[PDB]
């Protein structure tokens, strides 16, 4: 109850506009981590590529529909 909410509030950080900043940081991080040789950074890079292309698919779907 209260303890679970306190856990989530403790984990919580938060003011960033995101939007364009999200896609720009995604592309920079994916190209930074692609060069890496560590395993943890390899898993992180694959996760970022996954989100980068699921987002590319949703941008394509929004572009494809449009209701003037």
């Amino acid at each position: 109850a209260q303890s679970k909410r306190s856990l989530w509030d403790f984990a919580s950080p938060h003011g960033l506009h995101r939007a364009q900043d999200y896609r720009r940081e995604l592309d920079t991080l994916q190209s930074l981590l692609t060069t890496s040789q560590s395993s943890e950074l390899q898993a992180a890079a694959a996760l970022l590529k996954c989100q980068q292309d699921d987002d590319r698919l949703l941008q394509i779907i929004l572009n494809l529909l449009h209701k003037v």
Partner: protein, 108 residues
């Protein structure tokens, strides 16, 4: 191979979002990468502790020891330990840790 503060903030926000969407393991991977690159900030560790608690993993005790030995001024550091100890079977130690957290919250 260092990260920008912008990039560290992106990783923090993504980890928080993954925790906020139940994918505890995905948040753990993001925050583990962030800490392996920049270990300086403990907010990523702070949230990955709760992520590991929700992930059902002794590792939580180690992370709580890190937080207690580097930021012992937050009473929240005593809930995770309690949860870890109640997850690991040491119920009595969890009771003691919870009482300590209550005392520190009363202090705060």
């Amino acid at each position: 191979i260092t990260l920008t503060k912008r990039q560290q903030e992106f990783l923090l926000l993504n980890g928080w979002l993954q925790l906020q969407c139940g994918h505890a393991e995905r948040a753990c991977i993001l925050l583990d990468a962030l800490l392996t690159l920049n270990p300086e900030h403990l907010a990523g560790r702070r949230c990955r502790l709760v992520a590991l608690l929700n992930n059902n993993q002794e590792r939580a005790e180690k992370e709580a020891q890190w937080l207690i030995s580097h930021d012992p001024l937050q009473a929240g550091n005593w809930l995770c330990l309690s949860r870890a100890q109640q997850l690991n079977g040491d119920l009595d130690k969890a009771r003691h840790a919870y009482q300590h957290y209550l005392e520190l919250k009363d202090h705060n």
